[PDB]
Structure formats: C-alpha cells, structure tokens
Design a protein around this motif. Structure first.
Motif, PDB file in Angstrom:
ATOM      1  N   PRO A 130       0.817  -1.218   0.000  1.00  0.00           N
ATOM      2  CA  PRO A 130       0.000   0.000   0.000  1.00  0.00           C
ATOM      3  C   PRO A 130       0.848   1.264   0.000  1.00  0.00           C
ATOM      4  CG  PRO A 130      -0.773  -1.537   1.681  1.00  0.00           C
ATOM      5  CD  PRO A 130       0.510  -2.095   1.140  1.00  0.00           C
ATOM      6  N   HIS A 131       0.586   2.115  -0.991  1.00  0.00           N
ATOM      7  CA  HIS A 131       1.246   3.400  -1.189  1.00  0.00           C
ATOM      8  C   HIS A 131       0.902   4.405  -0.091  1.00  0.00           C
ATOM      9  CE1 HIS A 131       1.196   7.529  -2.930  1.00  0.00           C
ATOM     10  NE2 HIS A 131       2.342   7.146  -3.465  1.00  0.00           N
ATOM     11  N   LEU A 132       1.832   5.320   0.202  1.00  0.00           N
ATOM     12  CA  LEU A 132       1.548   6.463   1.081  1.00  0.00           C
ATOM     13  C   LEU A 132       2.384   7.702   0.768  1.00  0.00           C
ATOM     14  CD1 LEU A 132      -0.126   7.655   3.521  1.00  0.00           C
ATOM     15  CD2 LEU A 132       1.877   7.048   4.921  1.00  0.00           C
ATOM     16  N   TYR A 133       1.745   8.668   0.116  1.00  0.00           N
ATOM     17  CA  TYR A 133       2.251  10.028   0.053  1.00  0.00           C
ATOM     18  C   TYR A 133       1.118  10.976   0.430  1.00  0.00           C
ATOM     19  CZ  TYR A 133       5.066  14.048  -1.254  1.00  0.00           C
ATOM     20  OH  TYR A 133       5.783  15.222  -1.232  1.00  0.00           O
ATOM     21  N   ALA A 134       0.624  10.795   1.650  1.00  0.00           N
ATOM     22  CA  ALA A 134      -0.544  11.502   2.146  1.00  0.00           C
ATOM     23  C   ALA A 134      -0.539  11.460   3.675  1.00  0.00           C
ATOM     24  CB  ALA A 134      -1.818  10.876   1.578  1.00  0.00           C
TER      25      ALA A 134
END
Lengths: 388, 386, 393, 386
Positions: free
Chosen positions: C309-313
């Motif tokens: 799972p991506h995270l730039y937030a």
C-alpha cells in the motif's frame, strides 16, 4: 483560398565531401495566387531524372488545381493511385515532397510557422544529433575504421553542445540481404563504443547505427558485444523487408530498437511498432510527408515509442523535420547535417546551436531557395543518391 | 493571442429534452477579443461541481497560453496533479475548453476547423438519428413498441436518413454486466424485424445497447439479431471491461462499436486491440477535437471507423461535424436535430436529406444566442444522464 | 443500522518540509445516531477547492441516508455515477475517502478494529519502509543528488530497525510523458544503489522508485544499470497510461516491477497484473477504498503477486493501509512517512516501531482527528498536492 | 550471353478494352541476338513516367548481365538505391524485364519456360474468366443485373469454364475501407443466387471485390454470400491492411484470396500468416516468374493455393501459364480471351474447354506482332485503372 498551379523540380548536387548524399530533389510549388512552397523528395529506387517524371505525374494527377489544405484528400489519392492503395516509396516519395510544399504554402497564407498547425510549440528547443565526421586534422581514409579518430569527433561535438552522436562502424551494407557480421565487424564496433564512451563519459549518448545489413540472429550477436557501452539505440538492425524479424531482436537485447528510414506510410510504421521497435525514424520525404509523420508520432506514442526524424538529404527535409519535432511530445531528437552547403542552398535554415534547435518563427517552413546556388550545383548523372 | 477569460453555461433543454438533462457549454475569450465555444461532456458529478472543475483546469493549464498550443495544454491537462492517466472528469472539462481553442484558431485564421484538421476529405457527411416518438405517438408506450419504432424509422427514411439507432434492450444499471432476460432478447428481435420491414435496404440498423450486459449475455443477444444484419452492435458490455470485447467480436458477425465513455487515445487503442471496429468518441469527453483526430488515426491503423457520439448540445455537434469532414475513415455522425439545438446557437450545421454539408464560416461557425442560454439555465441536483 | 448524515471536509497543510504533500484532504462523516468516521481522499487532478465540491457531490448523490455496511452498493453507485461505469480517479478517489469513513463507523458500531472485518489478524506485525530523508546534519539541496548522504541516511534507518529503504535519484518528471533517461540519471541511479548497498549490506532491501518519467525502452536501460545491486523493486517505470508497456520491461529485467499508485479501480490493477507487474501499490484514497483494496489484494494473489500500500498523504490513509495490510497474506510492506505532524494531526496513529507496525487494538481505524491541529493548518493556496514539471529536460 | 537492348511498347486495347486501358510490354534483346518479351503491371504513375522507370532499372541492374542470373538481378532491383523493401513501381518494372530473361533462357536452351520451373506438374490448367456482357446485352444495365450475369455464366459453362468471377458489390474509391450499403449486400446475394441457378454444380463462384470495405463490413457481406458456397472471397479489404485479413478469415468459412496488389515474396508471407489461402500474384508486379515460384512455395507452406492474377495483355498471361504448369498448388489461372490478346502476339496459349494445354514451344512461346502494337500505341492521360 488558393489552388496549386505550377511545379519546379531541382536536381541539386552537394560538393565534396558530400554529406547528405549524391543529389537532392527539391520541389517549388506555386499557387494560383502566387505563393510558393518548398518540399523535398527522398527516393532512390530509380534515378533523379526518372523521378522528375514521377513527381510531375503525381502533382499533375492528384495535386494541381486543389486547395492546399486538402492534405488528407491528396494523400489518399496518391496512396490509392492506379488501383493500388498499398504503400509505394516511389509514388509516395514524390507526394511527400509536394505535400511538404503545401504546408509551406499554408504557413505563408496563414502567417504562422508550420508547427503552429501541428499542435503548437510543445518543445521550445529540440534535442539534436549528428554523425561523427572527420576532424580537420584527421586523415579521411583511415577515420572510418579508427576508434581513436572517432573519439576525437565525439569530444569536439560535445564541446559544441551535442548530447548524442551517431556512428556506423560495422562496414558495408550490400544488396545480398542480411548477412552474418564478421568478427572484425563486431570487434571494431565494440572498440568504437569503448573509445567513444571513454571520451564522452556521461555527456553524450551513443547512437549505434548499422544499415540493415545483418540477419536477425547476427544482429543479436552484435547487440551483446556493444551492450556494456549503454548505446541509446540500435538503429536498423536488419533489412527493412523483414519487420517481423525485429521481434526476436528486441527480445534478445536490452538496447532500444530504432528503425523506419526505409519505411513508407503510417501503415508500415504500425508494423514496426507491433514488432517491438521503440524509436521510429521516418524520412519525411519518403514516409508520406509532414502530416503522415504526425500520424507516425501518434502511433509511436500509443506504443510508448518515441520519434527521431531521419535526415540524409538537404535542408528542406530538415526544415520539415524541425517543424514536426517542435510539435511532438514523444520527440527524442532530430538527425542533423550542418554542412555549409545546407546553409547556402536555402536562407532561413534552422540551426543546431549548443546541441539543440530553436522553434522556427518565420511563416511556413521559414526557408527560401536561393536559385543561383541551386542551379550552379545542378546534378547530371544516372547514379543513385544512396547505393547498395 | 492568449487565452484570458472563461464563462460557463449550464443549459436545460425544454421538454421533451432530446439530448440530455443539461448541457455544459464554455466560452473562452482571448486577450485580443476573439471568442470560441466548447461543450463539456462529463456527468460523474453535477454542473456545480463541474463548474469548479472546468474553472480549475482552465486557470491551471490554459489561461495565458497561445490557443495554438493544444499538445502542450493536453499534456498539462493529462499530467495534472502528477497523474498522466485518463481521467474523464479532468479531461472531459478540458475537451470542452480545447474545442474553444480551435474556434479561436479558426476565427484568427479565417478558417473552418476542418481546414486545420487536414482538409475537406468529405464534401458532405453521413448522419444518423435515434428513433424518437412521432407527434401522434403515445410517448409512454412508444419505447417498447416495434410498430411505432418502425413508424418513426420509415419517416426518417422519408427525411432522407440512411441509418437509424434504437435501444429495445432496456435498463442500464449501476450493478454492472447482467444476463439479458428473454423478454429483452425477444423485444430486440421484434424491433429489428419491424424496422427492417419498414426500411428494407434504404436505412441501416444500428443496435445500440448501453453496456447493459455481461459479455456471455450480450453474445446471446447478438445471435438473435444477426438475421436482421444490423450495421453495428454498440456498447455490448460494460465500458470498464475492454478485454471482454474480444470474446464478443469473435462470437458475432456484427461489427462492434464502442467509445462514448472512453477518454484519451490510449483507451480507444485498448478497444481496438480487443476487437472494436467502430469508435464512438464523445468529443467533450475524449479530450477534444485534436485527440479525436488521433482516435481517428489509431482507428485507421486498425481498419476501424469513426462514429462521433452525440448526446449533448449544438457545440459538441459542431465540433463533431468538423472532425467528421476531415477523416477518410469517418462512418457517420450522430444527430439530434431538435428546434432547441437549432435555437441555442446560430450558424449550426444542419442535416439535409440525411447528410451534413461541410461547414463554411470561420471556426466552428456557431455563435451563442446568449439570452436563450441564460433564460434556459439549469437549477437543480440531478445528473445529465443516470 | 444507522444512516450516513453529514460530512465535514478538512484541507490540511503539512508544515515544512512537506513530507506527505502540499495538502491532505480529510473527510469526517457523522451518522444519524452520532458515530463519526475518518477518511482520506487522494486526488490531485483538480485543486482542493474544486475537490470539495466533487467530494460533497459524491456523498450527497450516493451515500447520505445509507447503512454504511452497504459498501458494494455505494461503490457501484459511485463507479456508475452519471452514466459512466469506468475508472475515474477524481470521482472515485473522492469515494475512497468516504468509504474509509464508513469502515471507521462500522468498526465503532461493532466494537471491532477494521482489520477484523477484512479476514482478521493474518499479520501480527506488518513490515514497513520509508523514503530516504535528510539526516539532520545534511545539506538539503545537496542531499537529493548525494549517494554518500543517502548511504548515511540509509544506515540511520537500518539502525532504527527498518528492513527496506526507498530513494529516487532518477531525476525530475515531466508532463511530456515517457522520455529517454539521461546517461547522468542512470549514472546517479547506480552510484546511489552502490553506496546504499555498501551501507546496509544484507540488512535492508533497496526500493527503486522512479515516478513514471521514462519510456519503456528507457526504463530497461536503467534497470540494466541497477540490477547488479539487486533492488527489491522497480516502481513505476513508465507512465501509468501505458500498462501494455509493463510487459516488455518486466520481460527484459530480473527486477520485480511495482506499480499502481496512480491506478484506480480493480479493473485497472488487473491490467497491470496481466502485463507483468508483480507488486501493486494502491493509494487507497484513489484506488476505491479499503474494500476495493482487499479485492486488488485478492487479484494480486491470483497472479502470485504481492501488495504494497502506497503512502504520500496523511495519517488517515496510513491507518487504512495498516488495517488492510494486517488482513492480507500477500502483504509485502506498507510505505510509511513518520513525521511529527502525522502524530499530532490525529491521536491513535499506528507507529512504526523497530521497522514494523503492530496490528492496532482500537475499534474502527483507531484514529480520532484533533480539530485544533486540523484548523490551525487549514489549506488556503492555489497550487496542487503533487505537480509534474513543465521543464524540457 | 549478355542482355543489351530494351524496347518498350505502350499498347492500348481497342473497345471494350477488356484487360485494362493500356499494356506496358518490354522487349529485351541480347548481344548474341536473342529476344524475350516481358510485361510491366504498375499503375502508380502513368505510361510516360513508367517508360522512364523501366529504362532506369534495366540500364542499372540488368544490361550486360547473363539472363540466367535472375536471383542477382532481383536482389539489385529490390535493394536499388539503398531500399531493400517492396516497391511496386521499381519491382513492377523489374518484373516485366525478368519475364523476358526467362523467354531468352527458353530460346537459348530450346525448351518451354515451365521446363525450368521444375517441369510439367500440370498437363493442362484450370482457367476462369470475368462475367462479361454478352453481345446482345445492354452494356450499361449489365453490370447491375444478376439476371444478365446468370446468362453470361450459362455461356461460359457451355464453353467448358468451371469457375466465373464477378464484382456486384460495386465501386472502389480512394477513400479506403468503408461499410457496404445494404444494396451492395443485396445485389451480391442476388448475383450469387442467380449464378448458382444457371451454373449448378457445373461451375464455382469466384467473388470479386476490390478492397472496398473495412474488415467488419467485409464480414457482414461474406455472411450474405456464404449460402451459395463461393469458391473464394477475393480482396475483401484494402491491401495496406493484411493484419485485417485475420478477423475476416476467422469470421467466414469462405476461403480468403488476395495478392494482385502486393509485391515481393515478403508481402505474400504476411498475407499467408494472417490466413489467406489463395494467393493471386500479378506477375508483372510481384517480382516476376521466379518470384511467383517462391510465392508459390510459401503458399504450399501454409497449405495454400496459387491463382495468377490477370488484368493485362497476353505476355503476363503467358508467364502465368508457364508458372501454373509447374506448381502442385495451382488452383486456377485468370483468363482474358479477347480477340486483341490473340492478335497482339503469335502462339498465345488459348483456353479450350476451360483449360490450357502446357505450351510446346521454347521460351514463353509468344512472338510480338509489331505493326499491330504500333497501330494501337497509347497516347493519353489516364491510368490502367482508377
């Protein structure tokens, strides 16, 4: 608006050394209103005379008495000429030159450079490259088989702002079809890349360009030798009559595959894309013209491929190359030949400055033919522009 | 010349509303003073939400630019927000605005748009229309009536139409693909029979479902209609399943048409790759006129044809006509000739004897009748289509 | 059960240095019966001003007056909105935020942490990585092109327990699309991999993240320079609009291909799986939410692929990741950003402790928003959360 | 012996010009004195510009060469000017000249041409003709009349023909693959229906079309004509789209035929892989007699058959006859038995009882009647076909 009215064809011979080939075929079309357009035919299947009658036929038949804007109409007519409707590098080579003029005319009438009608100024400057030519001090004869002499060309072109350099050290291309490379051909290839990377380091990409003289199994072997030099492309691995062969070649090397200079029509550029070629190099004077080239770039984009317009001709096909390039997102670079004669034959020739070309600002192709130079260099002889 | 100001028009068409609940028109005015119109075809969110979107994309990617720079505005629009992937909400909003750039480019150049899209390839262009209820037709019973559909069709043939569209396949729902009931198949065969009867060889039958069915189900439906030789089967399956088009095209002799809900030349490629031979972009959704032209290019490279979609106002229509004129592979343009369509603007291209003649005036050759547009403003909640 | 009633949207500006983005878009949905859920939207096509009208549109038109456990129902409605029924990162990215908010309300109603509604506690602890940020003694400007500084910063993360580190030396990304990587970009990529490889040894994987700058042919040249360093993945090699181009890249390189942060809808991920990606990285606030995330995870498994799972937030999408991550047998690792603001904006944020996150204990997402922090940092600017350079190259 | 002179004859066939507007005959003559006839089938540009192409090719790649070195001369013309890819103009010129090299070789060795193409596989060969208006038939209404076509077919049968070709689907336009009108479909049905009734099992139907239609349209049309069991479906789609042939072949049980407008062994390969099973090279275009032999070998590889195209004079005819005799996978040969064909040369192979005996005489067996050819010299503007 205007209709196309008259046509003049110039067979022009460039002086020794002669980069850009034996002769160039330039067209000047006049409208019924008086505007003139320049165009460049790129075909060598038959010689410069025979081609004069091919061009006159094509213009007279499908083009004279037509509104310049009707490009799709005129292309269709030319492609379909005589119940054919399949590609033809001779007939469609003619049309391309004439079509080029039509955009030059349309530019002049509508007071905007040709790219202003191709989607606009995507690229304020476009990346440029040249072939590694002898240095003033180099012995011409030995230069071609010398890695050390190529390395000096590489460095000097970098000192000029060139960010990519082309070279074809694998010797001669024959008519026999794809042969198997000599081990001396492989060696000199690896040595050329090795000396040039040694010279330039990070500052210029390597453009490895054989001329389709090898069979796909052989082309693979050569790819493995030059790989550890990170060439930015492998231009024309194999004969153009065998686009399906491109596939096995792509799947064997890491090096990107470049092709398309001997191809004609957006329908064949499709084939080259499907078979794994990722850099399309159309010759706008053979491939169908400016608009056909726009349709090639669109196809290339759809496959994630890039564009690198071809040049081995005059400064009129170069003018179109630049304009098409200016307006493409997927443009990689344009091939350049900055001889003094290219600069003298026409006025307003876009110039490679610090390895890039600025977006032309003059209406149309921005080039005007100086006639006295054109006819002082007029060509006489049977021979082909580029022979095998 | 540079792009300066933007006005948006939410227009509600009067009863019976052929063309949708509302139309989203934009007018862009250069710093010079030239104007151009465009229409936005995006309905995932309401006209209020979209107003803000259009305004966002315009200011962010377009305002201050030379209108001739389409590719650069299109790359900006596509890449917006660090995405660079097809978005019908951002791209839809841009498509409308792109049309306007051509209208300005047309006006500056004293040119019809087709004249900047490769010329007058086609002198007039082929048109078709949905089978709408006739003045005497009972509106509520009409839609499930083969008899009445046949009646409309025969009249269209009298008006000089060469093709008619109709959908007897029924309800499209948010559930995704479903099996057709036998009653949908039965009614679809009967409709065809009835329309084939009334037209003979004079009109083509275009079978337009709305992506109602699971592939396997749409195949059954296609077998039952083949004996009537429909010219296309449209949107047989959900548009989120472009790989499902492959098994459909191999299973039926009917050409497969899709497109109206796709955005970006990239997605139209997928549709081609998987077997569609008629592309039906809606220009106000698909990225605009120039993108349309490349949808036409990729379509050609496949032996496929173009059938510009209309379920909107006279601006997207005008755009559609201009694109049409310039393409060798153009099959037909979808037509809504309502008197309101006709009144909302002046200059509008008209279907005569089942054809539209290539336009004359510079640009799109349409100007907005401002009082009509404001007097017909849309206040509310509901979506263009649901 | 209860019905969804009201929505409050928060536009939040992370303080300098902005690890997380220019702004985060948080939603807080309240039920008729008084429960509240948090959710986060990942959308940057249009600005947060225009997004607020999109997010309010999606909620009002499909979600108000609905039992929050009707996930499938609202997702279908929100996918099919306005006669569409095809992936829309703007409309559905809006939905995702709200959908997360539902799972938060479901967790509070049922007294159950969100993971316990997605297949339970598969992973007791979840493997985590991070970007390579400036060590306090590093020059900020020089850091981004510094293989030695990235090695030092990599060493620091391994010493904190991290078992993977991410970096992007491949140079700025353009709106132009896929371009050919420069010899200097490839050079800097290898130098970066070599120095980090020496620093971490066997103690951390190398996560090579490009941002879709390059044309498929280019990507392969680059993959060739970094192979000797054995990177765990090559992420987003080519623009997300060309998934059929993953195939040729995956075939020419032995480096696993990770992607999908810019993809939305399980159908689009499917296409990336059919074309050779073996590591999918949804951003949950775009992909379609936690439940969509689960079904992207099930499709991954069908292809022997893994989930990252991506995270730039913000810390809400982070939580949502963590909970989805707890539940998947095929989870490789969650992307983390462990800033102070992240731990200030909410109370309950999952903490990466010794390179791993432990499955949370509280009902719902276990995260409450703190209004005062939220408001004091409210967004007001014009520009976007993420932007692509207009420069030539 | 070495090739020396070239004489070129642009010949216009008198009314009704069955076989095209004009024929490009070449006469080659060696140093030793030997003469051979050839024929160029290229229309891309007119007869004047072709005279100059044909001359250019021969002087560059051919004069001073032993006529036995066919492979060499073929490589040179194929690679001419750094091309090495198909070229209908250049290679079409080479093709005629290569035919002549075989006629000279026929004479130099005293044996028929086929005696050098692997011998006498077929004693006689299956022939077929276009349905031509009978003397009593109205010339304008014939082309649209199935009732008339049936009558032509009845008379071809009575003469011993076992196949007949016709194109009812109508006109070929520069616009590219298009959707067939319902009246082309209906007229193709009716033609087939009427011809099957007149011929019975006594003759196969060959369905001509000229690449008019897009693959999906070409699929529809096939569905209509399937019931009459035509022996082939010729050139369903434009020849720039060999990949398209693939979906056509999978959708119809009619064998697909193509080739007349292709050149180089390499292009027929492409056509085979996409699923055509009858290759129809036009020898004056394809590459020549030896090229057709290779085109015939690859046809065998795909389990395909060969059927020489004819829309030209009695040389291309003769060359097709000799190639045909020597191929196991020969299906038929196209015949244009006009009086003028028979007048333009001496010793022309005839169709008798629907078949052509293998020629007895050295070379191609044909000598040219100069004064006939000189009277009927061409001096106009138009193309062979348009």
């Amino acid at each position: 608006m205007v209709k196309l009215d008259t046509l003049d064809i110039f067979a022009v011979a460039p002086p020794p050394p002669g980069w850009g080939g034996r002769y160039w075929l330039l067209v000047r079309v006049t409208t019924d209103t008086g505007l003139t357009g320049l165009g460049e035919v790129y075909a060598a299947g038959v010689g410069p005379e025979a081609m004069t009658h091919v061009i006159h036929d094509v213009f007279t038949r499908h083009m004279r008495g037509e509104d310049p804007a009707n490009i799709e109409l005129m292309s269709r007519r030319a492609h379909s000429s005589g119940f054919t409707q399949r590609p033809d590098p001779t007939v469609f080579g003619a049309f391309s030159g004439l079509e080029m003029a039509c955009w030059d005319i349309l530019g002049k009438a509508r007071d905007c450079p040709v790219w202003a009608m191709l989607g606009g100024k995507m690229n304020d400057r476009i990346r440029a490259y040249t072939y590694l030519y002898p240095e003033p001090h180099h012995d011409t004869n030995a230069f071609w088989t010398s890695p050390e002499m190529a390395a000096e060309s590489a460095a000097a072109r970098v000192a000029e702002g060139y960010t990519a350099v082309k070279f074809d050290p694998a010797g001669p291309y024959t008519m026999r079809g794809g042969h198997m490379p000599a081990l001396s051909d492989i060696d000199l290839s690896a040595r050329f890349c090795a000396a040039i990377r040694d010279a330039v380091g990070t500052q210029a990409d390597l453009l490895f360009g054989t001329h389709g003289q090898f069979a796909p199994a052989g082309a693979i072997r050569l790819a493995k030798a030059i790989e550890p030099y990170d060439p930015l492309w492998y231009e024309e691995p194999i004969p153009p009559d065998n686009l399906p062969g491109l596939s096995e070649v792509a799947a064997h090397t890491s090096i990107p595959i470049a092709t398309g200079e001997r191809l004609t029509g957006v329908t064949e550029f499709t084939q080259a894309l499907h078979h794994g070629a990722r850099i399309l190099q159309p010759a706008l004077g053979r491939a169908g013209g400016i608009w056909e080239g726009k349709k090639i770039a669109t196809l290339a984009a759809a496959f994630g491929a890039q564009l690198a317009p071809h040049l081995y001709a005059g400064p009129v096909e170069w003018a179109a190359n630049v304009h098409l390039g200016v307006s493409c997102p997927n443009l990689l670079m344009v091939e350049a030949i900055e001889t003094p004669f290219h600069e003298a034959l026409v006025t307003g020739r876009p110039r490679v400055e610090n390895g890039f070309v600025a977006a032309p600002d003059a209406p149309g192709l921005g080039i005007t033919l100086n006639d006295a130079i054109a006819n002082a260099h007029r060509y006489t002889g049977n021979r082909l522009h580029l022979e095998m």
